[PDB]
Symmetry: C2
């Protein structure tokens, strides 16, 4: 009984560690792309405002 | 001895699985935010190009 429980625990720990590392990588890449996209959005909004004012003129 | 080892492994497995699941949920939220940022970027880009073309005309 103890042998079987130990084997199953080892396998579960392996799979959980793999999933956790995958999650950490996904979180990092998501944050990076999120920040880049937010900066691009700021640039686009600023350009839109400037060109709109010039258009009214 | 085997019972003690199995119980310790069980506790470690449970805590690591819980932390992995929570970080996965937060990663999903981050992906949703990234998708919204993508949409905002595309919309602002269309705004800018349309306004520039109108100004040229």
């Amino acid at each position: 009984e103890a042998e079987k429980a130990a084997d199953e625990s080892e396998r579960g720990m392996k799979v959980i560690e793999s999933r956790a590392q995958k999650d950490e990588e996904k979180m990092e890449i998501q944050e990076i792309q999120l920040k880049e996209a937010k900066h691009i959005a700021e640039d686009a909004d600023r350009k839109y405002e400037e060109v709109a004012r010039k258009l009214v003129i």
